[PDB]
Ligand binder design. Structure first.
Ligand code: TRP
Ligand code: TRP
Ligand code: CA
Ligand code: CA
Lengths: 468, 479
């Protein structure tokens, strides 16, 4: 019994490549969101694994018949929910090869090219973002490719916690206060809690439509000063560049000043919008980055990398390294993350950069921003709709105005979202901000072209005519 | 600019398939361990990314010329270091497809098939491991596919911590004590520190050659009772089934009885050896698993999955779920619910997730339980054979019993007038310098030993034979 034989591998893999290309060619045809009910797959797969081998033909048949029809097609050109997970063939080749090599790069020794290429690729990316040398290995800082935003933030939070605890002792853990926008409320508190921050020391900064739901420096300063007056230790601040709901932007320039002033570790989460900062017209959003303690952004969101791919830059690596242990030209990346093992994470990023070039990456950002701009202009031309909050990037938040119906505005927009999604011809999610229910169009799915967005607007108007 | 066009994709991906198959076909030819010096790759790549696109031909050339020669070839049939990362074409198909679909399965709604198939696969595997129904979604427990052992252990540690903190209040964190074998002192303490365990409340249980460096239950009981007497709260016990150094085995049956007695959450780390427990002649290592709080094993170690793939089962998911959320509404309701479907974001550190279960499903379906057992047995048989060869040479000695696929051995001290440790270190260095083999060493109980970690998917019987021949030749040269 040979699980890996090169020629059998070659045959089966070519067949899978063709199946995948056929899927990319057909997905526009499938309903974006699936109609299966919960538990449907339990009635279609046996309850125990087979003693005996099954032929690959049977498996592929079952995938087409029971798995894919049960999928939400994130790759559909008509997927506009959450944030697109953007892709590219260069990145897929990087994934294929990095997996096939299947190395574990916990140390430079356990695979030198992997570690060195990660350092190089992180410095490349730093230079495209025009970050100070204080974030670069060639300079005084560094970076690491993590899997997620959640674990990157957990790492920076633990670094800050450990600096505090070594200064003041472990029993000071009950004094440490962490701050995040009320717009990061489904992930930032979870991360703090994982780290042992007391429940009442996780503080959500209230925000209003008056700041476009970005953190108001005044508000955070008042909170920090009340906490210091009460004897607490302000420790960590998550500034979000592009919230998941409306892509609000916290002001890095002023918030980093408050952080520096109070010894607060400031981390900028730009999982989605950070990628736009490769374009000079978006780079002002990172003004003040030189004062910032850490920054992260997710290529597997808006930069053509598949899941997983999150970049984390740190200005003072030694604090992170100290935090993550119980005791030159190269690093051992096990020290920059939670676990020991690691894939060859940097290969696909290298392949993306080399294959496409900064020019095309900028073109790609700008093309998505242009299609969202166009869609917003369409929305403004229809007096029944309104843009609820400013479009800063690729996401348009919009809704039916209260005066189009005598029923509750929320119920009317919920019904419209339902009609749209039940069509199968589009997937969009909603959000609630400042008590206002709104629809979102998150433009960016790699296969989306301009006519897809045109057709979505046409569908929205058709269903709204039917609805009113 | 179209980063994704189906036909260009088809072309380039076919080309990469042919390249990858050629690498699998030729890797035995490359030196296993690389000779590059630190910083070698900086002198061969530009300091900045290019403005304009580069042709794929140039990139492939650079991968052949600057990357692969800088790799440690984990896929070589002559790689015997650490623990092998075993692979299979079924799993590679799962990786390709899981990636191409590029779904984000944070909730059931965000892709039903991904979540449902994960539940089914975890129950399949649980049954092959003959775990009680208390670890199954079809029963009263559950499981999740994580990336690593470190984050699985971290999650169970936080679950235990939060059970304590909700009982006693947050300021009691300074009383919570975690216990682990001194044979797991590189990963386990780091994890405890990450969860906020006070530095002095992370306790390594001393082990001796008298128990083959497995945890002595008596030792642990004495430690726990002294901690209770001093007012501490015993919280978490990490029992290791197959330590990284010598694949020592902590006794699940007695240790779990102790965990139950003192209210300690016991987690069984079976990253490597757990896969072997799919074979009846190894299932005894899980005797007592019904008393255990959580269990993990890594398919990307010994079950033909590529990196990453770690399976985690939990007997009381609600403790994990409470631990991993701040949601006031979920935390106020203290009951079990009628839902038949989960949102796996609640079972992990992050929100997003790949379609992780697909490749495991394809492994199980494509090979069958019988063949998977055959694979385990094949690696164990090659290791037993290698041990038998070593015992036939009176210059060498087996330092600790071979429990699975890893053989720990050394040159006896009396074979040379030099210090035994230096003699064995010189032998290891010569071996690795050959380029025809890679082995790591370990120090356990003050004893320096070489390790042979058999299992790399391309390794066949003649490879082990030739490694042993080489070892003997280099030993002859060395004396
Ligand atoms: N257990 C070995 C090797 C190892 C660690 N983590 C891994 C993950 C996958 C494969 C092998 C490993 C060690 O001491 O580091
Ligand atoms: N951002 C998504 C969830 C998410 C996490 N990671 C992602 C990566 C890609 C796309 C979406 C995600 C949300 O609003 O809940
Ligand atoms: Ca696009
Ligand atoms: Ca084998």
């Amino acid at each position: 019994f040979k699980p890996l034989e090169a020629e059998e591998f070659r045959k089966q893999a070519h067949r899978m490549v063709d199946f995948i290309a056929d899927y990319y060619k057909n997905v526009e045809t499938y309903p974006v969101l699936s109609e299966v009910e919960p538990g449907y797959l339990r009635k279609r797969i046996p309850e125990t694994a087979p003693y005996l081998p099954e032929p690959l033909d049977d498996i592929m048949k079952d995938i087409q018949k029971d798995i894919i029809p049960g999928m939400t097609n994130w790759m559909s050109p008509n997927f506009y929910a959450f944030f697109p997970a953007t892709v590219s063939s260069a990145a897929f080749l990087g994934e294929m090869l990095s997996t096939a090599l299947n190395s574990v790069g916990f140390t430079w020794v356990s695979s030198p090219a992997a570690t060195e290429l990660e350092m190089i690729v992180m410095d490349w990316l730093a230079q495209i973002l025009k970050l100070p040398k204080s974030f670069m290995f060639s300079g005084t800082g560094g970076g690491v490719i993590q899997n997620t935003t959640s674990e990157s933030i957990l790492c920076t939070i633990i670094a800050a916690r450990e600096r505090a605890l070594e200064k003041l002792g472990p029993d000071s853990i009950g004094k440490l206060v962490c701050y995040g926008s009320d717009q990061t409320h489904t992930m930032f508190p979870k991360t703090c809690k994982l780290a042992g921050i007391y429940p009442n020391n996780i503080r959500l900064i209230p925000t209003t439509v008056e700041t476009d739901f970005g953190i108001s420096p005044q508000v955070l300063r008042k909170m920090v000063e009340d906490d210091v007056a009460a004897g607490y230790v302000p420790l960590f601040l998550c500034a979000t560049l592009g919230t998941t709901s409306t892509t609000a932007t916290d002001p890095v320039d002023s918030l980093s000043e408050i952080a520096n002033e109070f010894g607060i570790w400031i981390h900028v989460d730009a999982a989605y919008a950070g990628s736009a900062c490769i374009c000079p017209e978006f780079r002002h959003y990172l003004d003040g980055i030189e004062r910032v303690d850490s920054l992260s952004l997710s290529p597997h969101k808006w930069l053509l990398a598949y899941l997983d791919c999150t970049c984390l830059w740190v200005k003072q690596p030694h604090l992170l390294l100290r935090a993550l242990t119980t005791n030159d030209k190269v690093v051992d990346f096990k020290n920059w993350q939670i676990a020991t093992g690691r894939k060859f994470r940097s290969l696909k990023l290298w392949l993306i950069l080399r294959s496409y070039g900064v020019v095309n990456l900028q073109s790609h950002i700008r093309s998505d921003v242009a299609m969202a701009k166009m869609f917003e202009e369409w929305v403004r031309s229809d007096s029944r709709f309104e843009i609820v909050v400013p479009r800063n990037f690729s996401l348009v938040c919009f809704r039916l105005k209260p005066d189009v119906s005598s029923l509750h505005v929320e119920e009317v927009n919920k019904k419209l979202l339902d009609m749209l999604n039940s069509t199968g011809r589009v997937y969009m999610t909603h959000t609630i901000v400042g008590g206002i229910y709104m629809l979102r169009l998150a433009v960016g799915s790699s296969l989306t072209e301009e006519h897809h967005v045109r057709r979505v607007w046409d569908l929205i108007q058709k269903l709204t005519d039917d609805l009113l």
